């Protein structure tokens, strides 16, 4: 209410009470919103308050005041507050009380100084400013004996170490002072170490001796506080935050230091003992229970392993020789702490990293790794380390190295692994124990197709056991049995399929013949996996006619029920209103969907068998669903029998989708499946109320478009007739209502646009108008995904419309302006700057058109003028209206700069963001939003260099 009308608080805070938190909130407001003589009076006043205040209950108002001082500094400093840094030293350098708060303030400020060349420049330019901050600190560290002050000082040093010039760090006595005077001491020791690790991260070519010294002295002090015979593992879990964080900091130090500087220490032959002592620590900390601690240790081990692998990479090179005394301990650690395999983004990573490290280490010495594993196994048989957790971990680690050994080595290894676990299973007493073991055996086996493909009798023995276990009622052994069966099927297809091995028939024949015997105790979800698994096998049959016969035998059971239902429907249509019949059709379809997914194109012999009946059932249930709603309305959707029919429609569409996208004969699809489909689904979708409309009608249109392009361009009018308008209404009054229907609508649009463009001319203009409104809505939406799609369509529509000169001009004349109006309206506004790079390309393209004289006739038809002038003005016009604050001299010059950067996109991008760079700095919080685009394209180069380095490592990807 009250905080609406600067002048007030200067007066208000003078005789105030507790309500002062509003006055501060009012001043912060004015400062952060609009930002000479006025605010110059504000700066002076603000500083005065704190100088007074801080020279204890007062504490909360101090931070509150400090906050705003930083708020202003973010806008003023240093170009229009140059003294600040020279001043703030002076004040503190005389009053300890004052020095406390300045440290607190400079710590706060650096949290608004948190882009690589941008920061590089700041470190260059503001060089003077930092220099003094460091010296203030030095002096304080040098002389003060006010503990609470010294702490705050150190906080600030840390916070600034990356910005203060190098020589101040290395050509001083900083390093030694920190290690001797501070690290040494309990309440200072954490910050001390953070600083030293911060230093240790510095990556340069000089200061070699200073680094080496930083290593040996810190080690020396460390060995004194947590001596190398401590049980860090236990120290961590027991001890307080104090001691916990110290351990975390220790590892952070050694890891940072060694990653960047190990080579230095390696070479200095007098430093082994101490090098080994650092590893000793890394092993001791690697014992720590907590994940966040392990993650840093693991980053270190991965570094070490990768270095040695890149030196080596066989099974003695000089750097390896250094580390042999402790390498097996790293092997041991991975094996004994292997994370649950991918079988959330953090945990996948955690496993991936551990796999990677172990795969490196395995290449270095496979014999050592096998031996660690064999022995971890013995200890499950011993009972000395027996536990479900332990056996699982072991087995995960065994599974994890699955490409790293040679065939022959692998074979020998697995043979002892399997035998021994088989033994372990016969020996343990539980049904519980036995299930845990049996899953582990199956898990391992599934990680090693290479082994299975090499030995038929064994593969076959394993698949038969899996069928046996598909009858086990114990907790999850039916699941592990199916899950294993699908892996093996997928990775060994050809071995099943009508290729005989050392015997009379293909094994697929024996499976198809005993399918009901096999699956009769599974539940639906498991039957589907079984069907999918057998699909892969059939998919491998290269002979088409042999493969037709397989599919028939394969598909025989669900076809029986299907046929029985259809027959009943034929005699009496009402059978399709029967709750159970409808539930059955649902699952027969889901089995079809699953088999089709696996088999792909040839599943046609099946889909074609049932297609017209299936589609007929679709119409009947459709007539049911709607007539139900036409006699009770919308609420009928709530009822369970309706949901049930709707699942049939859905799985119908999914099945068709599933096939078409896997299809390999567009003439066939076009002349044979497309018509009956279209009849059965389109008008239906139209006449149904918004609640009764299947979204998959849209995604199924989208797929068959993406797949057939020219082969169905002719049908697009029919499809849009029924589907285009009504679907748009459904989503246009945003009130996010049908997320599935819009994600679909746009996937269809984008498809028609990409593959069926000519259709847009065959639709009446009033409908093409609509297409545009709808594309316009898309790139106008909040959530990046929807925006990004809308842009993509537009940009393609542009390039595409160019291809047809006749109607190109109609479009340009009619829409051209309106589209910028709308695009600029998305760039200019309270910005969702998701697709800045898109905006760039779009605008660039559109400018070219006018520049290059491709818009043949004038946009202003009453005042004809060169369109590049008209646009140059029309944009300037639109800009000076969205930004009335902006000086009319900058507008002209900037709109000039743009068009002279059109036939080049990267620079046209930097030019435009820079407009918004300098114009959002007359605002504030923006920076990282526009910068967000560049950021991601550095992660995907870090992913691409990582992911492609993994290709050279056998077993890291397998």
């Amino acid at each position: 209410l009250k905080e609406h009308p600067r002048v007030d608080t200067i007066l208000e805070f003078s005789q105030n009470m507790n309500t002062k938190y509003y006055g501060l909130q009012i001043l912060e407001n004015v400062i952060k919103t609009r930002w000479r003589n006025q605010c110059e009076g504000i700066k002076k006043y603000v500083v005065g308050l704190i100088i007074k205040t801080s020279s204890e209950k007062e504490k909360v108002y101090i931070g509150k005041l400090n906050m705003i001082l930083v708020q202003i500094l973010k806008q003023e400093w240093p170009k229009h507050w140059p003294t600040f840094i020279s001043d703030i030293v002076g004040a503190s350098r005389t009053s300890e009380s004052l020095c406390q708060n300045n440290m607190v303030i400079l710590k706060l400020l650096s949290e608004e100084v948190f882009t690589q060349v941008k920061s590089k420049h700041l470190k260059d330019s503001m060089c003077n400013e930092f220099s003094q901050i460091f010296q203030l600190c030095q002096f304080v560290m040098e002389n003060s004996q006010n503990a609470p002050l010294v702490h705050a000082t150190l906080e600030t040093l840390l916070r600034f170490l990356n910005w203060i010039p190098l020589g101040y760090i290395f050509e001083t006595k900083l390093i030694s002072t920190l290690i001797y005077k501070f690290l040494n001491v309990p309440m200072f020791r954490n910050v001390s170490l953070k600083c030293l690790t911060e230093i240790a991260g510095v990556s340069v070519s000089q200061y070699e001796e200073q680094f080496v010294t930083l290593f040996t002295l810190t080690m020396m002090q460390l060995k004194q506080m947590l001596p190398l015979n401590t049980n860090i593992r236990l120290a961590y879990s027991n001890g307080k935050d104090d001691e916990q964080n110290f351990i975390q900091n220790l590892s952070l130090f050694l890891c940072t230091f060694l990653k960047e500087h190990d080579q230095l220490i390696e070479k200095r032959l007098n430093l082994r003992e101490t090098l080994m002592e650092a590893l000793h620590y890394m092993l001791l900390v690697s014992e720590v229970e907590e994940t966040e601690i392990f993650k840093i240790c693991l980053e270190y081990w991965n570094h070490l392993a990768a270095e040695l692998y890149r030196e080596s990479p066989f099974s003695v090179p000089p750097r390896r020789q250094l580390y042999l005394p402790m390498l097996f301990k790293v092997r041991l650690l991975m094996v004994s702490r292997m994370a649950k395999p991918e079988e959330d983004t953090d945990s996948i990573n955690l496993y991936k990293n551990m796999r990677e490290t172990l795969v490196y280490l395995t290449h270095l010495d496979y014999v050592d790794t096998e031996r660690i594993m064999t022995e971890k196994l013995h200890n499950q048989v011993n009972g000395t380390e027996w536990s479900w957790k332990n056996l699982n971990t072991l087995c995960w680690a065994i599974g994890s190295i699955s490409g790293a050994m040679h065939e022959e080595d692998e074979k020998r290894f697995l043979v002892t692994v399997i035998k021994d676990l088989l033994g372990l299973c016969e020996q343990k007493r539980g049904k519980d124990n036995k299930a845990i073991i049996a899953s582990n055996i199956m898990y391992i086996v599934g990680q090693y197709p290479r082994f299975l493909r090499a030995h038929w009798k064994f593969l076959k023995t394993v698949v038969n056991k899996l069928f046996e276990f598909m009858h086990e009622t114990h907790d999850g052994v039916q699941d592990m049995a199916c899950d294993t069966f699908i892996k093996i099927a997928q990775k060994c297809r050809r071995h099943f399929v009508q290729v005989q091995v050392g015997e009379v028939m293909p094994f697929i024949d024996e499976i198809l013949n005993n399918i009901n015997t096999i699956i009769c105790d599974l539940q639906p979800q498991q039957v589907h996996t079984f069907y999918e698994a057998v699909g892969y096998m059939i998919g491998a049959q290269t002979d088409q006619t042999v493969q037709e016969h397989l599919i028939e035998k394969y598909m025989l059971l669900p076809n029986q029920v299907w046929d029985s239902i259809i027959q009943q429907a034929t005699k009496n249509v009402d059978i399709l209103k029967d709750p159970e019949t409808v539930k059955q059709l649902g699952s027969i379809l889901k089995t079809n969907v699953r088999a089709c997914k696996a088999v792909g194109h040839p599943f046609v012999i099946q889909l074609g068998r049932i297609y017209l009946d299936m589609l007929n059932v679709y119409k009947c249930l459709s007539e049911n669903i709607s007539a139900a709603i036409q006699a009770n309305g919308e609420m009928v959707t709530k009822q369970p029998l309706i949901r049930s029919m709707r699942t049939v429609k859905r799985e119908t569409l999914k099945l068709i989708s599933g096939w078409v996208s896997r299809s390999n004969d567009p003439q066939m699809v076009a002349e044979n499946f497309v018509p009956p489909l279209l009849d059965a689904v389109l008008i239906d979708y139209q006449r149904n109320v918004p609640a009764a409309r299947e979204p998959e009608v849209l995604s199924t249109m989208a797929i068959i478009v993406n797949k057939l392009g020219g082969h169905i361009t002719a049908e697009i009018p029919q499809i849009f007739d029924a589907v285009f308008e009504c679907t748009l209404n459904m989503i246009n009054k945003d009130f996010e209502e049908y997320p599935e229907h819009r994600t679909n609508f746009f996937l269809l649009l984008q498809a028609v646009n990409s593959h069926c463009f000519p259709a847009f001319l065959a639709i009446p203009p009033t409908q093409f108008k609509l297409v545009l409104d709808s594309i316009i809505w898309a790139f106008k939406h909040t959530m990046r995904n929807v925006a990004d799609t809308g842009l993509q369509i537009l940009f393609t529509l542009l390039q595409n419309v160019a291809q047809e000169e006749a109607a190109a001009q109609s479009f340009y004349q009619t829409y051209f302006c309106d589209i910028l109006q709308h695009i600029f309206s998305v760039v200019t506004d309270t910005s969702h700057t998701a697709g800045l790079t898109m905006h760039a390309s779009i605008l660039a393209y559109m400018f070219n058109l006018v520049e290059e004289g491709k818009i043949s006739t004038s946009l202003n038809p009453g005042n004809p003028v060169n369109n590049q002038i008209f646009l140059q003005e029309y944009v300037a016009n639109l800009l000076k209206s969205a930004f009335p604050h902006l000086q009319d001299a900058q507008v002209k010059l900037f709109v000039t700069g743009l068009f002279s950067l059109n036939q080049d996109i990267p620079a046209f991008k930097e030019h435009l963001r820079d407009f918004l760079v300098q114009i959002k700095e007359f605002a504030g919080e923006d920076t990282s939003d526009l910068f967000l685009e560049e950021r991601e394209i550095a992660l995907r180069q870090a992913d691409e260099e990582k992911h492609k380095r993994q290709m050279s490592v056998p077993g890291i990807f397998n």
Partner: protein, 267 residues
């Protein structure tokens, strides 16, 4: 070694070490002999019939609990493969011809009828004309418990045994009795064997037949309203007890000729 590995995995790798389990093929058809195969069955059968005689586990309460094993898993009496053919087979045993389908524990309890797999995974919860499986037929302890093979294509629960009927438990009765009770209680019910909104699934009981050579011959030549999955051989006297038992024997029809050394017509 690789042969040694396969043999080890085929024949010595089991979670519940059931003798002559039908989860693996008939021992008479395995290339490997499991340690879980036993060509012996009579001694174990005699031994079990003795044990049954002195009933020392309360079942009356088990029947109501469901309205000795825990929740809804492994409640059905499951056969071994028929291997060691009883010398008094024809006098002391009967054969039930089974339909292709899925085994099901059926519990009709207060206005509803829910089916379970041997695993205890509920497969359906529905309505039935069985003493406890209807809102109108929902009463004070009128629950019934069946053992059925569900045939999806005829949408019928074929009844194989009865463990409880209208709150009366039969676990501790002989098979001849139990089978007699089901063939007498079933037809006593408004169109079970038919389809109504109140009874979605038909419950037909399965015929059983004597096991003299001539009788089996007849059986094999009969025509059934379903596709023949196999032949269950029950000892007339066995009580109902959940688990694998040698007191019931299973064979697929193509095996009867070989294992029982009897004639067969065309097939």
């Amino acid at each position: 070694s690789m042969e040694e590995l396969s043999q080890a995995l085929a024949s010595s790798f089991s979670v519940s070490q059931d003798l002559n389990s039908t989860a693996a093929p008939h021992p008479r058809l395995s290339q490997y002999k499991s340690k879980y195969s036993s060509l012996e069955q009579s001694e174990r059968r005699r031994r079990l019939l003795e044990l049954q005689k002195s009933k020392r586990l309360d079942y009356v309460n088990h029947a109501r609990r469901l309205a000795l094993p825990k929740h809804y898993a492994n409640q059905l009496m499951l056969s071994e493969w028929l291997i060691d053919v009883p010398s008094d087979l024809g006098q002391e045993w009967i054969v039930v011809v089974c339909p292709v389908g899925k085994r099901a524990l059926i519990v009709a309890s207060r206005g509803s009828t829910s089916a379970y797999t041997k695993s205890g995974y509920c497969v359906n919860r529905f309505s039935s004309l069985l003493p406890g499986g209807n809102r109108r037929n929902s009463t004070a302890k009128d629950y019934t418990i069946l053992d059925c093979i569900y045939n999806e294509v005829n949408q019928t629960y074929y009844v194989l045994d009865v463990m409880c009927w209208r709150g009366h438990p039969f676990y501790d009765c002989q098979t001849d009795f139990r089978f007699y009770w089901m063939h007498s209680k079933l037809p006593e019910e408004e169109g079970l064997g038919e389809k109504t909104k109140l009874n979605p699934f038909k419950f037909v009981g399965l015929k059983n037949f004597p096991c003299t050579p001539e009788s089996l011959c007849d059986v094999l030549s009969m025509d059934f309203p379903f596709e023949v999955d196999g032949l269950l051989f029950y000892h007339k006297q066995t009580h109902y007890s959940p688990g694998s038992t040698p007191l019931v024997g299973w064979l697929r029809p193509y095996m009867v000729s070989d294992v029982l050394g009897v004639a067969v017509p065309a097939g």
